[PDB]
Design a binder for these strands. Structure first.
Ligand code: K
Ligand code: K
Ligand code: K
Ligand code: K
Ligand code: K
Lengths: 8, 321, 18, 321, 321, 321, 321, 18, 19, 317, 18, 20
DNA sequence: CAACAACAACAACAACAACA
């Protein structure tokens, strides 16, 4: 799933 | 490998490098674009037949997942969305964290409201570490009016405690003189930001050039079509690198008819295409002195609430008591 | 390189002879 | 070769003389103007096909770079911008150098404020050497009201120690009787600017004739479109040659709401088109005697403040205590 | 060939005589008039198509100079302007020659200040030779108040040594009963000005009928538009024929707005329209006995000052010290 | 054939009878009244369209000349104006003939000065033969204070050797109870002047009811607009029928803004509206005993001077030495 | 049926009883009051719209004649008015019959002159039959000083032979404690006067409470406006019911506005408002012993003269020679 | 008709018969 | 046609007062 | 219950206690005082709005009649007006009963005349029973000259047989040092009057301090306005509490053009605000003469009185 | 509900001096 | 072929009035 | 299914005596 930039 | 896989890793999947270079010069720079591309535009390209298009589309769909997923996993992933702080506590509270990455935020209002100041503050803030509000990323400024000032970036960087030269070396700048240049800027920006970590894209303003490039009813329809194309490209970027796209918009009067009067009513220009295309919408109004009021106009997750901020010598901040 | 107007370091003959 | 290259350079790229002749006839006297022009304008031009327009655009884009830069280079290039003194120390302190070149400065206010006096002072100070705060170039004056007085030019030239005859010779003057004449004067101004070297372009008043030429509610849209075209042409000239564009604006009464400022609230005419077109905005008002007050209404990099100047027999200057 | 060219010149230019007659009936009695007119005005005339209007405009522009020129030429031309003596030495010194031809001069003040007296004196003196401060031309008097007395004219003519019968013979008089008649009279004014030589046009007073014909806040916009059209017609006459246009205004009391509560604040009526249209403005105040004070309210080349004049039995003159 | 043309003549011009009846009901009882009215005034009439109003105006403009004429003709026509003697030789000398027909004379002063006595004397002296200084016609008296006494009329008739009953039969008196009735009486007055010959119309007093009907701030604008409309209707009557209009005005005390502090300074009420509307202004003061003094406050063709009169048992006359 | 028509006549004309009741609460108890009121006075009544007010005014104008009438009818009506004798032969000869009805007579003077004695004598004498010089009606007394004494009424009734009980029972008495109560007493007076027959109303003194309620220059305008309203309402009552309104006034010592002084110069108070409102003015002065002198200060028809009267045990009478 | 004050010939009952 | 200002002195006016 | 009703009655008809407290602080202690005041004074009180003042006035107007009544009722009300004896039979005959309550009586003359003696006699005699000619109430003495002597009161009390102790106790005394102190004393006097039966109020003199506190032509208007306000406050007190107010006035010489070359001071402001005016003159020996200078119901006449060791009384032959 | 003109003799009053 | 700025004192004009 | 703001007016109000 590619929902954008991730903190982790 | 959280970032998109570049277009360099399908040649081992039985794809001739010549087709890869043709796709690269056509505008496709990652497998994400190919897997998310309709077949009709891959057929309209020059040098690719139907069989080759099918054989590349099937493998691209094989590499990139495309199907149904559980809502719990979607919520867990959305819990990990980076939100860029605007430098104001009230604005942060109103936006519930800040500007969402991988999303389109359009802000509109009359002149001197402070859209360019907000854009400059966001551009300088995007370079902060994640835990402080930033996204470890650079910034890009596609400006169509001619109101880019490095001095404001220097001032806000000094406020946040950063080197002026270092914070300036991360911001890419480009000016568009017409709509075709505006589209070619995105075409070049894809290849610019595939190789580097970018976390903010700013267009100020998208609709300024369309107001004069196409004038009158006779050229209206074509106008809209072009705008739609531009917006679609923006959406692709939002799904290709997760950058947050920020757009500023202009307003016009309601001369034809005032809805029960609204103290000089104003409506954003662009039509319904950008109203439907944008995800978050903000309305900026002038108050007393340097204080301005920001109101949510349309958002699928936030209530319509107002907040008060100000534009000081260090950028966008809270109201000074 | 970009141009943002009249460069201050341009070598141009003075308009007035004074 | 800091100045723009002439259109004849395209002759070296293989384009025949007929194409260059038609391009010059339509109003493209410079390769930069051709590059900044969209394909639609070239297609509209009689005698050029799709392939010819594409070749011309490609050659123009090859000649002039239209790519992505770095904010450090922008800061370096902006720091070398010539600013023309306005004849007053307080005004220069407020403007942080004076009238900027390559941008649009608008001045508005009630009658007797001193817009024409500042225009005369600027037109006479643009010919000073750069070390003295001038622009080292000729002045251009377009008048739509019939209030151009060379005696003021002579007075300020005598104040600054210049000769009257050559100062008068270095100022070009034209009068526009209607809006179409006003627009044709822009093409003529571009044609003559290609040959000589200018630094200032003054329009006074920019919107004086639009009040009468387009009277009524039914002609509002056409008036706004014509004003938008005029402002876009002014922006094109400023981008092409780098000269500082200064336009004056009239005022109208706010009888509908009476505002909150005072018993005589006034707002500039022209609407959102001129509100968004201009870069810097100055509001002039009368003080006491021969003293006037200037306020920064809107500026991308100047904080809100006020300055207090005066008009004497030697032009616009500082108040005598 | 200093005077304007009659429209019949277009007959030897390639224009149909019937179309020339239609233009003349529409109010264009001179090549300058059609040249200065916009394309919309020629389109509005019945029987004139777009191609005919474009050809007429091109042919007319071929016969008049509507381009760029140096400032020294403008200074040389303005040094030869004709200024009409008011009859008072102090007023002549204040205005540096007197009333200037080709522009608009307006006087305003309360009652009995002496506006009609100045109008009568100027009407008499405009027929003097150039060496005596006149213009060697006839006079026009459009009167909207019914206060035309052809006995002051005889007194001034006796003072200046001219024949009273000839002075009365060489003055044209008309009365305006409403705003529509007032604006209509200008067409006949131009039609009969193209034949003979006139030097002065007088409207006394311009805004008397607008107070009553358009009453209330709901009729403000229409009144201001009509006033703007009238002032534009006056400016067109002044540019076409070079006559000196003089208009008379009235005053209203500032009930609460500004003026710092002086003895009795008073401001001219007409608003920003008449404030911006007039080139020179004079404020008349009552002094002691038969003496009055004139002050330069607004002028692009004359400093603010004051002068003292008187209304003697032979018109406007100097106070008997 | 020196009188006005009845509206029925418009029937012979090719105009229906229904719209003629509508015009007559609207208050236009003469072709001159229709010709002097603006287009918007005829449009406001119910049952009249734009085409009908245009046709009516075009046909009315043919029967009455409204154009340009020489000043010699105006002088010849003004040399034949009937002037009504006021009953005193000194007043006749001061006014150079007496009260002038076709204009408005406003007489103001303190209480008991004698303006009502002057009106009563004029109502009798206007019925004299022309060679005796009269006007050979009836008289009108619109009294808004309740101070109409026919005994003074009888005394003046006895002085002049005219039958008392015949003098009384030729005076039409009406009383106004409020401002709306004051304006309503003028319509019936205009309808009644058509069938007979009237030489004098007296309003006493014009602004008595306005002091009380509109009280305080917030009603000043409406009061002044109503007063202006009333004065314009009076002027239209004077121009239409060539009657002598005399109006009586009151005074107020100048509390602030010391004029000269001579002895109890007083200012006429009504403001700039009535200041500009009236053509001649007379200031009446009390002298010693029965002698009073009249001064020319404002006149376009009369010098400032003073005359002495007295109020004897036979009306206004010369002081008995 | 010479009296006024009660407001219960409009109900049988197309007006609902609710509107009549609302008008009655507004203080209009007679069709004449409704007819005399302007439209804006009826608009201010709650629950009455523009259409209702127009219908009511049209009905009232239909019932009450307010047109143009000749002077002979006015003379006939003026020869039949009732004049009330003051009790003294010399005063009756001076006033040519006595106090007039339908007008306002104001007596002013210093203290002890005998204004209250004259008022008491008039109150008694107004009840006499027409042959004896009375008005045959009741009397009203609004007293603002506490100086009302029925003993003088009894003495004068004894002198005239009338029974004391009948004289006392026909005198209505009210005491005014401030200005607002003074005005409300007039509404109550109209309400109680519509039913019975009254011939004389007394205000003593009209301007006593204004000297103390509105003290200072800052409260002068409101005081004058309230006094004007009070006097206008009194005049409305006089025109309504034909009563004789008699008011008393005080004096103030001149200090500097005269420059020519007798032993002690005094002028009436109330200013121009009361100077203009009053129809007849009498000045009372103290003679030798019990004798006093009355002078005609202001009268539209009475020549200025002086008469001598006295104050005896039976009220105002002739001096004993 | 007209109305100025109280008419002298208007019939009215005697207030004080006596 | 000529213009008009007021009542004309030379107009043909019928006698209002025969005496 | 013929006297004024306390302001607390306004509590019973729909007014909060706080409004009553603010009205009391402003100087209004009875319903009649509120009724007699216009809207301007009620608006001027801080904290009171337009609607609240309108409600207060409408509520107070119903508790006291404010309309039209026939002259018979006024005559029958005036027929039982209490009049206080002056102490001299001749002066009682001259005044037709003596000093009347509810109006303003002013006495003026030269020095060594006896105005203060008459004031002392009135202060003593206002406590007599109604049969003897008193008012059966206490007395107040506002003094602006320091000439208040209780020994005269004791002498007159001994003459009439009343006890000295309760006569002295039933007299309130106050001294005014400046012009504003007079109005402050009146404001305090209102609160003293509301809570007890008071019959006579004395001001001696009502114009002494105005001569010295206000000087020159430039201060004439302010002095006249302040005097008018003071006189109106006195009139309001007299109308509200039904007391007999006696004020004393001095004389000024007539040095002007021509002419007794003595006239009362204060001008038209005090001339028009006095119901009864008495002019006192010094006669032969000790006896003095009194004349009715101005009165709305009494004719011009002269009487003779004398001041003895027991106060004002008839002149023995 | 009458008009108070001052101090009334008929009004009952406590004896000030018994 | 040049601009006009009103009536010019250098232009020829026949005498409107006779000599004086 | 889009785009486009314009326009100011109106003055009123007098009060206060004093000093041989
Ligand atoms: K801007
Ligand atoms: K101007
Ligand atoms: K005038
Ligand atoms: K009068
Ligand atoms: K009195």
């Amino acid at each position: 799933l590619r929902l954008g930039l991730s903190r982790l | 490998s959280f970032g998109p896989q570049p277009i360099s890793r399908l040649e081992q999947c039985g794809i001739n490098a010549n087709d890869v270079k043709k796709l690269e010069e056509a505008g496709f720079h990652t497998v994400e674009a190919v897997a998310y591309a309709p077949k009709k535009e891959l057929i309209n390209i020059k040098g690719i037949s139907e069989a080759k298009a099918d054989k590349i589309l099937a493998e691209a769909a094989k590499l990139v997942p495309m199907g149904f997923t559980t809502a719990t996993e979607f919520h867990q992933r959305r819990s990990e969305i980076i939100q860029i702080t605007t430098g104001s506590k009230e604005l942060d509270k109103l936006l519930q964290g800040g500007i969402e990455t991988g999303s389109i935020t359009e802000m509109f209002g009359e002149f001197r409201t402070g859209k360019t100041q907000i854009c400059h503050t966001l551009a300088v803030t995007c370079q902060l570490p994640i835990d402080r509000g930033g996204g470890e990323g650079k910034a890009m400024y596609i400006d169509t009016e001619g109101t880019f000032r490095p001095e404001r970036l220097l001032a806000v960087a000094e406020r946040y405690g950063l080197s002026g030269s270092d914070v300036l070396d991360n911001v890419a700048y480009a000016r568009a003189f017409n709509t075709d240049h505006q589209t070619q800027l995105l075409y070049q920006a894809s290849a610019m930001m595939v190789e580097s970590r970018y976390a903010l894209l700013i267009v100020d303003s998208a609709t300024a050039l369309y107001r004069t490039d196409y004038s009158g009813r006779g050229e209206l329809s074509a106008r809209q079509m072009h705008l739609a194309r531009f917006l679609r490209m923006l959406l692709r970027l939002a799904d290709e690198f997760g950058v947050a796209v920020v757009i500023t918009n202009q307003v016009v009067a309601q001369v034809d008819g005032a809805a029960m009067f609204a103290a000089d009513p104003k409506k954003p220009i662009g039509g319904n295409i950008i109203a439907h295309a944008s995800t978050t919408r903000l309305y900026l109004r002038k108050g007393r002195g340097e204080t301005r009021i920001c109101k949510i106009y349309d958002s699928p997750c936030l209530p319509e609430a107002e907040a008060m901020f100000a534009i000081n010598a260090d950028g966008v901040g809270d109201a000074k008591d | 390189s970009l141009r943002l107007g009249l460069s201050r370091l341009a070598r141009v003959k003075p308009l007035h002879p004074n």
